[model samples]
Target: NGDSHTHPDYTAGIRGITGNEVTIFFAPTTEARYVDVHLKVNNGQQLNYRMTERNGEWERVVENLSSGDVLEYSFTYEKLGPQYTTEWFTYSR
Candidate 1:
């Protein structure tokens, strides 16, 4: 659908666990550069998660999170500089 191509250049994903990895695709979906990801909890406390790029795509580890706890996170897309958006996600994994 054409609508898919017109949306904001973003990366979105839910807070999920290892066995159920979520996919985060950027606007120019196949490209990957430097990116920053931050994770937080329901009461507005932030837990740190780091990101790394492999095969032109970025991947995150869910082992840092405990099962059944909820968290909200944001990802900043970095292309020589950092640009991104904030999103809310609940972790039930």
Candidate 2:
């Protein structure tokens, strides 16, 4: 059944920025069993967060980031017994 499932069009981006706090948004196109965001902050250790779904969008808020901080992220989701992961994306604050 996993092989027959059509993968969704996954997308991610910055949703909002407010005073050292940033909101990251991800759209997986369909609901999955789990959705997570993996982040590497300023070339440091990787951090993982479970994203909250609102309507059809998944989002997470990251705080205490500096103006010149670099962020690298990717999305991972599981649905219908299949696990999917997206390529790494980079952003600067």
Best by lDDT: 2
Alpha-carbon shift of residue 52 in model 1 (angstroms): 0.6
Instruction: Give the distance in Å from residue 87's predicted Cα in candidate 1 to where it truly belongs.
Output: 3.0
Q: Candidate 1, which segments miss by more than 4 Å at Cα?
A: 1-8, 14-30, 42-44, 48-50, 79-82
Give the 10-residue window scoring lowest on summed lDDT in candidate 2: 1-10
For every model shown, the clashing-pair count is: 0, 0
Taking every candidate in turn, the Cα RMSD to the unseen true structure, in Å, is 5.7, 7.2
Candidate 1 residue pairs that clash? none
Residue lDDT tens for model 1, 51-77: 667666555654444555555556666
Model 1 C-alpha lDDT versus the unseen true structure: 0.50
Pull out the clashing pairs in model 2: none
Give candidate 2's total backbone clashes: 0
Residues 1-93, candidate 2: write the lDDT tens digits: 000112356666785787768887876666677789999998899899999988877888989888888888888887677888877777788
